[PDB]
Amino acid sequence: MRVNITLECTSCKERNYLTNKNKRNNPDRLEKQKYCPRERKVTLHRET
């Protein structure tokens, strides 16, 4: 079951990214280091 997800910034809570994952292959929330345009810095981003 491949699904669309949003990656929220764990610092400022801005929903910065649209991406997708297969829930069967990635049960847990996808976490990535992505640039936050608000904070203008790379921050941990987590699926919300």
């Binding site: 079951m1 829930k23 069967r24």
Partner: protein
Amino acid sequence: MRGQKMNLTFGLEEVYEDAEFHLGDFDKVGIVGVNGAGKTTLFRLLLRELKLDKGKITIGNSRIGYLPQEIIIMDEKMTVLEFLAEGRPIKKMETELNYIYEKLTVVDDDKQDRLLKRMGWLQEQLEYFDCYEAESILLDLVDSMQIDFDLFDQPISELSGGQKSKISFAKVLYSKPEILLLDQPTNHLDSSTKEFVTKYLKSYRGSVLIISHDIDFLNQIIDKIMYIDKVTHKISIYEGDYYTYKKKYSENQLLREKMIIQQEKEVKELATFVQKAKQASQTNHALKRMGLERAIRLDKKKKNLTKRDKVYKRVKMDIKPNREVARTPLKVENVTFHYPGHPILYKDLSFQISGKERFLVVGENGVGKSTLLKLLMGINIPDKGKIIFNDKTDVAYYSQELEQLDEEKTILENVKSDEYTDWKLRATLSNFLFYDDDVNKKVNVLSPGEKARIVLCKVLLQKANLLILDQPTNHLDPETQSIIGANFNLFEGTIIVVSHNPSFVEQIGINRMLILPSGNIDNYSPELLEYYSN
């Protein structure tokens, strides 16, 4: 207590889907569901330990007394008194308050305002939880369940499963709560102890939610029954007792089944006519016309046709011994054992099993039942005597506290054996209701009931001819218990069993019962009740 549009999905397997429930105050709600249904998860939502992915869960401001399904032993060396005392926040606040006094001396005129407010609240909070409890707890043990004071100074980890359940239940009461959330409060209790719990819960004036797989226990207390559905991922709340819930539920599923039947007949009728027109000659214009018109109705029917919920599959057990039992599977002769520093549990214990025999080790809580079984396997070395297993006897052990699973590893990793290939392991786990990627789940996230199935699967995969089972039906849903008992009855091997569940022993059909602590190898009969009375 109220929940709206509840949603919760751990990875790919979901628990609640648009579930709702409203519990009125002063309702003794009996929570029922198969293992994994999500009964424990509901309490975690109430305790705010978990957060719903979507929806709102509403809880009253009153203080909640929570009895966990698993005992929480923070450190192995914790004493029973320390464990019980942790129920009340008296000790925690004093440690904070003692530090506050230290800060007051260090700080002169900077933090005094903040410190003074914190000191005042702690004193007021401490008085609200009157510090006289130190004496009340000591006597709460006496009046509650006849908990001896020798246990009071003993490490909690060393207590028996039944004894631990008494302590945990007492701890909840010690906290003086306003709402009772009891998660299997009688999991290991014996018949006598269950009587006290039932009477207190009957008398308890406040709201009490009970998760229990004991139908008789619930029927005496429950006025409202909440059923957590495993297939619909919803919550339904009935008024009455367990039987009333079964009656209402069975009727509803019957009435739903009949609805789906009639909707299928109408779809088949249209389908049958559409096909008849489809295969008619192209020259029959009117029939071809009518065929297309009915094709439109057929499409609209198939799009409003309710799906029948897949009935939850029940466990299938086929336990067979690889080898054959002997006339003397196990020889115990003049075996004495005592835990260092405690009275001897039994002296010169000598019994002899016969083979393909149902051997019941009867007793009460904290009498040595689990110690005897641990003795046979080799966990405990006998202080005196000998225990001899015939070379033809293979032994499978089901421990009481589920100590045979690696919490860190997955389900498949736990069951991994040198004698079984991958697809063989998966097939049996599916027979135990672990389907597809449900076997890659960590054992640490499973419920106690689901873990019990993994332990049972390990016992089954051994194909041993002697089964040492210590309370096997514990943590199992009522349906799985009957399956367990029926299949063991047909087991073609020797069974050494311990069980405080009267129904389970009847299904197995015990032959000889060994009473404790007064060693009495006896033929099994309703005289078991006579020993229980005496």
